[PDB]
Amino acid sequence: ANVWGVRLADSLSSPTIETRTRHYTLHDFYSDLDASVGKEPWRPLRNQRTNEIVAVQLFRPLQGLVFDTQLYGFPGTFSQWEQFMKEKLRVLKYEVLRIYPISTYNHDRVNVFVANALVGAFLSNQAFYDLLPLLIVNDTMISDLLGTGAALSQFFQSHGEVLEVAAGRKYLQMNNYSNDDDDPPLFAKDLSDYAKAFYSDTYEVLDRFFWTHDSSAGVLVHYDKPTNGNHYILGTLTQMVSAPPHIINATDALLLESCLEQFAANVRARSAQPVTRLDQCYHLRWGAQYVGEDSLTYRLGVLSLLATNGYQLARPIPKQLTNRWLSSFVSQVVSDGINETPLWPQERYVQIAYDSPSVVDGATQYGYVRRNQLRLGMRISALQSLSDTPAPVQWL
Amino acid sequence: YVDDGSSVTGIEIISIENPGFSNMTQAARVGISGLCANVGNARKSIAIYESHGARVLTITSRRSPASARRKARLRYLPLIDPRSLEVQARTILPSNPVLFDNINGASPHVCLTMMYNFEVSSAVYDGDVVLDLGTGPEAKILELIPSTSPVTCVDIRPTAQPNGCWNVRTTFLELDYLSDGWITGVRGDIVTCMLSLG
Amino acid sequence: TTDPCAPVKAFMTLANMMVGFETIPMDNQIYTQSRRASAFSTPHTWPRC
Amino acid sequence: FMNIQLISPIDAPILRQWAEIIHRYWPNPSQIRYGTPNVFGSANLFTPPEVLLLPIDHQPANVTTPTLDFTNELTNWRARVCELMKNLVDNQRYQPGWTQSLVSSMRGTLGKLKLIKSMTPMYLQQLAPVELAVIAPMLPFPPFQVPYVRLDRDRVPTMVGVTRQSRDTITQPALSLSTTNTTVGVPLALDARAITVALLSGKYPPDLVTNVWYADAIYPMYADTEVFSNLQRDVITCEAVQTLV
Amino acid sequence: TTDPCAPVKAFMTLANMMVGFETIPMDNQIYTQSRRASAFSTPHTWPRCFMNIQLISPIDAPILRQWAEIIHRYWPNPSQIRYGTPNVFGSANLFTPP
Amino acid sequence: YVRLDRDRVPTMVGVTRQSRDTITQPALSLSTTNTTVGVPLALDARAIT
Amino acid sequence: TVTSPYAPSVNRLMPYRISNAERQISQIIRVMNIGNNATVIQPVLQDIS
């Protein structure tokens, strides 16, 4: 085993096969706009008790909702919001289709950042037409966007060999989200500016970028499979409450959601089916001096290392997270106790033990270092959970 | 998994446009014949539909190690005629591709055909002359024998397999094999009658 | 008046007069919604909106 | 106030609403580059060199011909204060106290004061941070900052304080710094109304181009040698204490 | 004029007038595009965006790319003409043919 | 005179007093102390135009 | 923008570079007497205004 809240014993596991991705093309970008009933970007979250739609998770083509909620004028209910979005995306689709004819459909890659910021500018009525000639990519995604100054600075900006975008609103809050204990938590991703991503070609440019600029809150990495090129994530100092005995700022909730996804994915691994990422974690990189010893950020960094090495939690994780279970887990992890695990976080590289079942150290190029010195006394298999049996059972 | 054409077994599809009643070019003909050489003796499903304001058709089929063995037996690939595909003026709505199409399952007459064909393929060794005694429902035998083995096949119907440009000798002829005075002209080492004597 | 760019001025007078009351998707950062309707005088300046 | 759930929406919906507006729509600090650490040094402690904390957001200017715009957090702040006051005059517990043709003119005054056309929130996010970054190296008292915390109670800076001697027998300054402080700081009292009028009533010159205005606003400033002379004063200040000890 | 670098000043004058409307890359973070054209008086200050035209993209700077290309194509060409005489009167020519 | 070619632009003109096969104090002449190739002069662009 | 020449030059002596530590020590000594003053402070903010 236990750190402060107990995790499961010896059987540790991890996914094995990683699928490879394909580039986002105009043939797919046309299809994402005219949202069919089978394929649509949004998928609805819902309350567990009342079984009502309270939140919406957004996907690939619209992920640039960085402005405030009153700028967009969204409806309150999900059934009206979905029809609103389906009605407006085709009006944008014809505007794309006039400038770029559909005869170019075969193997023409589009810029993902321009694709997100175009729908973010059109839904917010902020000067979209400059971004439209910059949609087709050439020579890389970022260097087409470094020199330019066409789009508005809220979407993206350049600092010289470093592209800074403003990632925003993975989730979207509906009208009847009343912060109930059965509501799904949103992890401070219904807010305007919870993080800022910093894209570049190599990591040596970004490491010199964070020598001049401050890393006060803490910076986060992917190190497995970056979305649109290798980058860092810098969290801000806004706060999601969501859990009445606790206050969790953005740079801790952003780490905690990614830790819980990997704790969930270490159970579902059956050594035959592939996943999209061998690990989901973040592993705090530079700000570890400014964060406190044995505080919430340090303890979630320890748990994020444990999830990467492949440990499993004792009590099971629900399929949909609830706001009461999340508060219980945070109150269980902020308790007293010592770290029984020989793993310890380090700024220089995230390490992997010798008998960890994860094969990501050979998969990616670097960032992951197979440390040979430290060894854990556990053997690999998945856990075995089962039903409830609500009557008390006789024991002998 | 996502596929890439690197696995031995798997699905593979094409998508070439077809504007109106156009005689298709040599490029599309080479492409369709390349699909028919890449996968052999499997079922091919097609679907013609206007995608993105343009008429396009797809050809869906499933490659196999037996067809990979078949592909090695030919020095040149043949060309298909476009006459079966130039006529179509309809709009076949497509569907998502699956790896295992038959959800009802295989019939016993197909499962017994596999039992015959596996014993034939285990019996035939490499570098041997064979002779097929009766085709059957398809020309499965060309995918059963190893690649260097020269074959010949008797029938009562004219065949539909392409003639010429093979890596080894083959002979496709029909003569109603119950007659006499024709085996003295032919030369082989092992006969195979499967589901034809009855 | 006989200038060909008169309807865009007659339109964008109203878009100047209601800024913040309701907004429209203009085409760049220079000739935005709040830029004065005098300066819309060439056919390239006519907005896509 | 630290837990919004203690305010019930049945009793105090307007206080619940104003607490939510504070906890969501309050501006967050940012950071901006300044100075040249090659020839000049970097005088700021408690922050890394070549960074300037400032309590609001900033966006770099994309155009040199500025024009009117409403899309920033300070105009959002003005809009939400005005809409809170509209809900307050639309309270059923409050509205029959007033008469007809007072509530209507109150709503009109608030809805117009939301849509007032002032350039000051644009200036404070586009041009005031780059002007502070221009001015700040050429100051005789170079900038001295502790971090701006937005709303976190457990990170609020109390007690900045210096030392000048070790205590009793102990030698390490890390061991003697706790009980030999001298707390530094004064409060300065401003005026709210003179700030509010400058927020609501700021305009530009009629045809300003920023790279032309800042070309001759800054060119007379950089013929002085006072900042270079302070760098010679500082070294004798540092040598004298070593000679003393 | 007999400047060794007249085309660089001819390019950077328009590059200084056109700031905030079009952007072009430079070599470092110090020498901004808005550095005035009177400073480009030596060969070691010539920008790479002027040395290679292909670093100026036509979508970020079309008019400034046209002004880069008109300089590289239609700037006047030097030549040489005979004068004086050899075999008598000598020739005071240094570093040129006499 | 060169146009547009960076690697052949002159930058400095000097006068050598000492011989070729000796190593003496480097006594650069006065003409090498200019920023340009020689003494600079100004010209009014108005009258040339 | 400013301009520095490019020519071989007579040597100059312009002592103006100090390390970071000397400037921080001078900063602490400058803070230590200016603390709790508010009458030297307010002219500084007045002049910056």
Q: Please state the three-class secondary structure of chain E as a single string.
A: CCCCCCHHHHHHHHHHHCCCCCCCCCCCCCCCCCCCHHHCCCHHHCCHHHHCHHHCCCCCCHHHHHHHHHHHHHCCCCCCCCCCCCCCCCCCCCCCCC
Please give the Cα distance from A252 to A330 (Å, whole number).
11
> Mind telling me how many Å the CA of D212 is from chain E's nearest CA?
10
Q: CA neighbours within 13 Å on the CB side: how many for A380? A: 16
B178 annotated as belonging to a binding site for a ligand = yes
For chain B, the three-class secondary structure string (H helix, E strand, C coil) is CCCCCCCCCEEEEEEEECCCCCCCCHHHHHHHHHHHHHCCCCCCEEEEEEECCEEEEEEEEEECHHHHHHHCCCCCCCCCCHHHCCCCCCCCCCCCCCCCCCCCCCCHHHHHHHHHHHHHHHHCCCCCCCEEECCCCCCHHHHCCCCCCCCCEEECCCCCCCCCCCCCCCCEEECCCCCCCCCCCCCCCCEEECCCCC
Q: Which of A222, A213, A218 is nearest to A195 (CA)?
A: A218
Whether the Cβ atoms of residue A175 and residue A76 lie closer than 8 Å to each other:
yes
> Mind telling me how many Å the CA of D118 is from chain E's nearest CA?
23
Chain D residues with beta carbon closer than 8 angstroms to that of G28: 45, 162
Please state the φ and ψ torsions of residue A350, each to the nearest 5 degrees.
-80, 125
Please state the φ and ψ torsions of residue C20, each to the nearest 5 degrees.
90, -30
Partners of residue A56 on adjacent β-strands? A44, A172
What tokens were used for G20?
A: 């970071």
The vertex-F1 CA angle with E98 and F2, nearest 5°, equals 130
Three-class DSSP category at A177:
coil
CB contact under 8 A, A127 and C48: no
B4 annotated as belonging to a binding site for a ligand = no
Interface mutation target, options G2, G23, G33, G44, chain D, most CBs of D under 10 Å:
G23
N- to C-terminal Cα distance for chain B? 45
Chains in contact with G, where contact means 3 or more Cβ–Cβ distances below 8 Å, are D, E, F
Q: What's at A244, amino acid-wise?
A: P
Beta strands in chain D (DSSP E): 30-32, 52-54, 160-161, 183-184
Please give the Cα distance from D67 to D121 (Å, whole number).
12
Three-class DSSP category at D75:
helix
Chain C residues with beta carbon closer than 8 angstroms to that of A122: 25
Please give the Cα distance from D163 to D171 (Å, whole number).
13
The vertex-A378 CA angle with A374 and A380, nearest 5°, equals 115
B3 annotated as belonging to a binding site for a ligand = no
Please give the Cα distance from A227 to B10 (Å, whole number).
28
Provide the chain A residues 89-108 that lie in CB contact (below 8 A) with chain B.
102-103, 105
Partners of residue D212 on adjacent β-strands? none
Please state the φ and ψ torsions of residue A219, each to the nearest 5 degrees.
-115, 145
Chain C residues with beta carbon closer than 8 angstroms to that of D114: 20
For residue F27, give the chain G residue with the closest CA. Answer: G8
Please give the Cα distance from A357 to A360 (Å, whole number).
9
**How many Å separate Cα B198 from the centre of its chain?**
25
Chain E residues with beta carbon closer than 8 angstroms to that of A134: 59
CB contact under 8 A, A128 and C32: no
Three-class DSSP category at A72:
helix
Whether the Cβ atoms of residue A287 and residue A325 lie closer than 8 Å to each other:
no
What tokens were used for A279?
A: 């690990």
CB contact under 8 A, D67 and C32: yes
If you write DSSP's letter for every residue of A212-254 in order, what string do you get?
Answer: HS--SS-EEE--S--SSSSEEEEE-S-EE--STT--EEHHHHH
Q: Interhelix angle for D226-244 vs G20-34, to 10°?
A: 90
Three-class DSSP category at A275:
strand
Residue whose token pair is 């007459």: B109
For residue C28, give the chain D residue with the closest CA. Answer: D63
> Mind telling me how many Å the CA of D236 is from chain G's nearest CA?
9
Q: How many CB atoms lie within 10 A of CB A353?
A: 21
Residues 6+ apart with CB under 8 A from A285: A219, A220, A221, A232, A347
Q: Which of B29, B43, B195 is nearest to B116 (CA)?
A: B195
> Mind telling me how many Å the CA of D106 is from chain A's nearest CA?
23
What tokens were used for E11?
A: 């390019």
Touching pair F, C by Cβ (3+ pairs < 8 Å): no
Provide the chain E residues 38-57 that lie in CB contact (below 8 A) with chain A.
57
Q: What's at A223, amino acid-wise?
A: Y
CB contact under 8 A, G17 and D164: no
For residue F44, give the chain E residue with the closest CA. Answer: E1
Please give the Cα distance from D239 to G22 (Å, whole number).
9
CB-based burial, B17-55: b 16+ in 10 Å, e otherwise: ebeeeeebeeebbeebbebbbbbbeeeeeebbeebeeee
The technique is: cryo-EM
Whether the Cβ atoms of residue A326 and residue A243 lie closer than 8 Å to each other:
yes
Please give the Cα distance from D120 to D66 (Å, whole number).
12
**Which residue precedes each gap in chain C (C to N above 2.5 Å)?**
none
Whether the Cβ atoms of residue A232 and residue A197 lie closer than 8 Å to each other:
yes
Partners of residue B58 on adjacent β-strands? B15, B47
| Dihedral in degrees, nearest 10, Cα atoms D173, D175, D178, D182 | -20
**How many Å separate Cα D179 from the centre of its chain?**
32
Q: How far is CA A29 from CA A89, B52, C5, in A?
A: 11, 12, 36
For residue D63, give the chain E residue with the closest CA. Answer: E20
What tokens were used for B134?
A: 């009766």
Q: What's at C7, amino acid-wise?
A: P
> Mind telling me how many Å the CA of E34 is from chain D's nearest CA?
8
Size of chain C, expressed as the number of residues it contains = 49
B156 annotated as belonging to a binding site for a ligand = yes
| Dihedral in degrees, nearest 10, Cα atoms A25, A30, A33, A34 | -140
Please give the Cα distance from D239 to E1 (Å, whole number).
55
Residues 6+ apart with CB under 8 A from E74: none
Q: Which of A192, A77, A186, A185 is nearest to A124 (CA)?
A: A192
Interface mutation target, options A102, A106, A107, A276, chain B, most CBs of B under 10 Å:
A102
Please give the Cα distance from D163 to A151 (Å, whole number).
50
Three-class DSSP category at A110:
strand
Whether the Cβ atoms of residue A177 and residue A69 lie closer than 8 Å to each other:
no
Q: Kindly state the helix (H) or strand (E) to which residue G48 belongs, with its residue range.
A: helix G41-48
CB contact under 8 A, D238 and G26: yes
Chain A residues with beta carbon closer than 8 angstroms to that of B52: 27, 30, 102, 105
Three-class DSSP category at F41:
coil
Three-class DSSP category at A168:
strand
> Residues G35-43: contacts with CB within 8 Å, 24+ apart?
G35/D162, G35/D182, G35/D183, G35/D184, G35/D185, G36/D184, G36/D185, G36/D186, G37/D186, G38/D186, G38/D188, G41/D186, G41/D188, G42/D188
What tokens were used for B197?
A: 């004597």
| Dihedral in degrees, nearest 10, Cα atoms A259, A265, A271, A274 | -100
Q: Kindly state the helix (H) or strand (E) to which residue G46 belongs, with its residue range.
A: helix G41-48
Three-class DSSP category at D155:
helix
Please give the Cα distance from A180 to A322 (Å, whole number).
9
A56 exposure class (CB count in 10 Å sphere: 0-12, 13-18, 19+): buried
Please state the φ and ψ torsions of residue B17, each to the nearest 5 degrees.
-75, 160
Whether the Cβ atoms of residue A338 and residue A315 lie closer than 8 Å to each other:
no
Chain A residues with beta carbon closer than 8 angstroms to that of B53: 102
Of A133, A146, A160, the CB nearest to E59: A133
Please give the Cα distance from B169 to F22 (Å, whole number).
89
Please give the Cα distance from C19 to A125 (Å, whole number).
12
Chains in contact with B, where contact means 3 or more Cβ–Cβ distances below 8 Å, are A
For residue G2, give the chain E residue with the closest CA. Answer: E39
Please give the Cα distance from A303 to A309 (Å, whole number).
10
| Dihedral in degrees, nearest 10, Cα atoms B124, B127, B132, B136 | 60
Q: CA neighbours within 13 Å on the CB side: how many for D169? A: 0
Strands A219-221 and A195-199: unpaired
| Dihedral in degrees, nearest 10, Cα atoms A30, A107, B23, B163 | -130
What tokens were used for F20?
A: 């070729």
CB contact under 8 A, G20 and D41: yes
Whether the Cβ atoms of residue A40 and residue A367 lie closer than 8 Å to each other:
no
Cited resolution, angstroms: 3.4
Whether the Cβ atoms of residue E22 and residue E60 lie closer than 8 Å to each other:
yes
Residues 6+ apart with CB under 8 A from A115: A24, A29, A61, A135
Whether the Cβ atoms of residue C8 and residue C26 lie closer than 8 Å to each other:
no
Residues 6+ apart with CB under 8 A from E60: A147, A148, A149, A150, E22, E23, E24
Please give the Cα distance from A377 to A370 (Å, whole number).
17
For residue E34, give the chain D residue with the closest CA. Answer: D211
Please give the Cα distance from A277 to A279 (Å, whole number).
5
Sheet of strand B172-174, all strands in order from the earlier edge strand to the far edge: B172-174, B153-155, B131-133, B191-193
B115 annotated as belonging to a binding site for a ligand = no
For A324-373, the three-class secondary structure string (H helix, E strand, C coil) is HHHHHHHHHHCCCCCCCCCCCCCCCCEEECCCCCCCHHHHCCCCEEECCC
Whether the Cβ atoms of residue B59 and residue B39 lie closer than 8 Å to each other:
no
Q: What's at A115, amino acid-wise?
A: A
What tokens were used for D57?
A: 């957001």
If you write DSSP's letter for every residue of A73-98 in order, what string do you get?
Answer: T--SSHHHHHHHHHHHHHHHHHHHHH
Angular region, B150: left φ>0, alpha ψ -120 to 50, beta rest: beta
Whether the Cβ atoms of residue E23 and residue E61 lie closer than 8 Å to each other:
yes
N- to C-terminal Cα distance for chain D? 52
Q: Which of E90, E45, E50 is nearest to E72 (CA)?
A: E50
Chain G residues with beta carbon closer than 8 angstroms to that of D146: none
CB of E13 within 8 Å of a chain A CB? The answer is no
CB contact under 8 A, D62 and C29: yes
Q: How many CB atoms lie within 10 A of CB E82?
A: 6
Touching pair F, D by Cβ (3+ pairs < 8 Å): no
Whether the Cβ atoms of residue A123 and residue A72 lie closer than 8 Å to each other:
yes
Whether the Cβ atoms of residue A185 and residue A329 lie closer than 8 Å to each other:
no
Residue whose token pair is 């632009």: F9
Whether the Cβ atoms of residue F13 and residue F37 lie closer than 8 Å to each other:
yes
Size of chain A, expressed as the number of residues it contains = 396
What tokens were used for A307?
A: 């999830």
For residue G4, give the chain E residue with the closest CA. Answer: E39
CB contact under 8 A, E39 and G1: yes
> Mind telling me how many Å the CA of G3 is from chain E's nearest CA?
6
Rg (alpha carbons) of chain C, rounded to whole number: 10
> Residues G4-8: contacts with CB within 8 Å, 24+ apart?
G5/F35, G6/E42, G6/E44, G6/F35, G7/F32, G7/F33, G7/F34, G7/F35, G8/F28, G8/F32, G8/F33
The vertex-B60 CA angle with B84 and B92, nearest 5°, equals 60
CB contact under 8 A, C26 and A95: no
Report DSSP state, residue A262. H
Touching pair A, E by Cβ (3+ pairs < 8 Å): yes
Please state the φ and ψ torsions of residue A18, each to the nearest 5 degrees.
-105, 130
Please give the Cα distance from D109 to D115 (Å, whole number).
10
CB of A149 within 8 Å of a chain E CB? The answer is yes
CB of E9 within 8 Å of a chain G CB? The answer is no
What tokens were used for B99?
A: 């790896």
Q: How many CB atoms lie within 10 A of CB D202?
A: 15
Chain A residues with beta carbon closer than 8 angstroms to that of D76: 68, 70
Strands A156-158 and A43-46: unpaired
> Mind telling me how many Å the CA of F45 is from chain G's nearest CA?
22
Please state the φ and ψ torsions of residue A56, each to the nearest 5 degrees.
-130, 125
Whether the Cβ atoms of residue A335 and residue A248 lie closer than 8 Å to each other:
no
For residue C31, give the chain D residue with the closest CA. Answer: D67
Partners of residue B193 on adjacent β-strands? B133
Widest Cα–Cα separation across chain C: 32
CB contact under 8 A, F3 and E7: yes
Strands A163-165 and A195-199: antiparallel
Q: Which of A154, E68, G17 is nearest to D71 (CA)?
A: A154
CB contact under 8 A, G6 and E35: no
Q: How many CB atoms lie within 10 A of CB A42?
A: 17
Chain G residues with beta carbon closer than 8 angstroms to that of D221: none
Chain E residues with beta carbon closer than 8 angstroms to that of D67: none
Chain B residues with beta carbon closer than 8 angstroms to that of A274: 1
Partners of residue B191 on adjacent β-strands? B131
Please give the Cα distance from B70 to B150 (Å, whole number).
13
Residue whose token pair is 């009206």: A80
Q: Kindly state the helix (H) or strand (E) to which residue D82 belongs, with its residue range.
A: helix D73-89
C37 exposure class (CB count in 10 Å sphere: 0-12, 13-18, 19+): middle
Q: Which of A208, A203, A228 is nearest to A366 (CA)?
A: A203
